[PDB]
């Protein structure tokens, strides 16, 4: 692929705290229109353009909740912006609008001569990661046709309508023990509703409470192996990452209580 970055991968490469690039960050003021500000993480030392990803939290949570994803994913070769919403009380439709405004914001930074990410962003290769109500927001955006990869984390929403209309390869992380967005009412029906025409996966984390997809605790191995691979394969067309997503006996992993998907990915 024209978009491939980094060494030929292994589980060890994915399990490491960082990928091949050093990372820097830049704050985006909450005064910005369209969302509550955030932090842009980006790799240093690179040339050319790369995929860009927005990461969004859930109800009454801040960007810190999901910020493990920022440096982790950036270090493999992505521009990754973790955001706050306008208020913690925003619901999924509002969160979808703010994901779109944050994506537009990154797109705009690519051509701003003062931006630290000027010229780094392939504005046709965009992804989204979102927790809980932000994961409902993620599925809403996935149904709109712009983004090329979606990772809902312990999603919450009031309908499966948008999941049934997803236009982007979608990996849902579920948390087995979730009592806030119970899997039987949210992540499972949303996955089950996804169309047959997209690459898709459901990874339910064994014993996980509702925060199990956020990163930064005891679940980084599964989150890394599936999550980085998902963005590599779907944003970079990097078929070197298929080996992690299709082949292995996922349910047999101690960290996975349930797996579903439509491998092989073609
Ligand atoms: Cl929520
Ligand atoms: Cl919980
Ligand atoms: Na298992």
Numbering used by the authors: 40 to 305
What do the authors say?
The structure of variant PE-H Y250S was solved at 1.35 Å resolution; here, only the N-terminus (aa 1–39) is missing. The crystal structure of PE-H Y250S contained a PEG molecule bound to the protein surface. As the result, a single amino acid substitution (Y250S) was identified which led to a significant increase in enzymatic activity of PE-H toward different substrates, including PETb. Interestingly the comparison of both structures showed that the substitution Y250S replacing the aromatic residue tyrosine located next to the active site histidine by the small residue serine significantly improved the enzymatic activity toward different substrates. The loop arrangement narrowing the active site cleft in the wild type enzyme is stabilized by a polar contact between the hydroxyl group of Y250 and the backbone amine of E102. This structural rearrangement further leads to an increased active site cavity volume from 153 Å3 for WT PE-H to 362 Å3 for variant Y250S as determined with the program MOLE2.5. In WT PE-H, residues of the loop connecting β3-α2 (F98, V99, S100) together with D129 and I219 are arranged in a way that access to the active site is limited, whereas PE-H variant Y250S shows a much deeper cleft. In the variant Y250S, the catalytic site has twice the volume than in wild type PE-H. As a result, the predicted binding pose of MHET is located in the catalytic site, whereas BHET still binds to the same groove as in PE-H. MHET is stabilized by hydrophobic interactions to F98, V99, M172, and I219, and the ester carbonyl carbon is placed at an optimal distance to be attacked by S171. We furthermore succeeded to significantly increase the enzymatic activity of PE-H toward different substrates by introducing a single amino acid substitution, namely Y250S. This substitution resulted in a rearrangement of the active site conformation, favored by prevention of a polar contact of Y250 located next to the catalytic active histidine, and a loop region of the active site cleft.
In this study, we have identified the protein PE-H, a novel polyester hydrolase from the marine bacterium P. aestusnigri which hydrolyses different polyethylene terephthalate substrates with mono(2-hydroxyethyl) terephthalate (MHET) as the major hydrolysis product. The PE-H protein shows a canonical α/β-fold consisting of a central twisted β-sheet composed of 9 β-strands flanked by 7 α-helices on both sides, as already reported for homologous structures, i.e., cutinases and PETases. The highly conserved residues S171, D217 and H249 build the catalytic triad which is located closely below the surface with the S171 position known as the “nucleophilic elbow”. Two disulfide bonds are present in PE-H connecting C214-C251 and C285-C302 as is common for type II PET degrading enzymes.
